[model samples]
Target: TLVTGSEYETMLTEIMSMGYERERVVAALRASYNNPHRAVEYLLTGIPG
Candidate 1:
């Protein structure tokens, strides 16, 4: 899906509400193309190095 800037913001808000840190959430979202599960995994466990 093509996510616009506003969409990204909305997604960020949702993820933040779920208790994901803003920095790590954005990092993981960018790293995994907005895959929530992967983002969460990366957030919980260090994503490689």
Candidate 2:
């Protein structure tokens, strides 16, 4: 299952607030399947190739 619009927006908002770029954050969030924890981890450690 995938995240709903509001769930996506919430994750986007929280991660965006961390000063990351929009598209990168979007990429990370999507890559992590909307898991904010993993998204943040990806942002910090670099998304896997």
Candidate 3:
């Protein structure tokens, strides 16, 4: 996705509203942007500690 910092921030806010913790949501978003499948896998497995 190659998001700018502001765009990533926006995503963080959106995810938070959706009930994700801020840090976990950000990590998930980054994981997704890095690899969509892996992101899904990570989400399914739950956020890393």
Best by lDDT: 2
| TM-score winner | 2
How are the candidates ranked when ordered by lDDT, highest leading? 2, 1, 3
Write the residue-wise lDDT of candidate 3 on 1-49 in tens digits.
4545775666656665666665665688677764434444556678755
Estimate every model's Cα lDDT from 0 to 1. Answer: 0.67, 0.73, 0.61
lDDT-best of 1 and 2: 2
Better of 2 and 3 by lDDT: 2
After superposition, which runs of candidate 1 have C-alpha atoms over 4 Å from their true positions? Answer: 35-38, 41-46
By summed lDDT, the worst window of 10 consecutive residues in model 2 runs over 1-10
Regions of candidate 3 where Cα sits further than 4 Å from its true position: 1-3, 34-45
Tens digit of per-residue lDDT, candidate 2, span 1-49: 6545677666667887887666566788888876766776778888776
TM-score of each prediction: 0.56, 0.68, 0.56
Residue pairs in clash, model 2: none
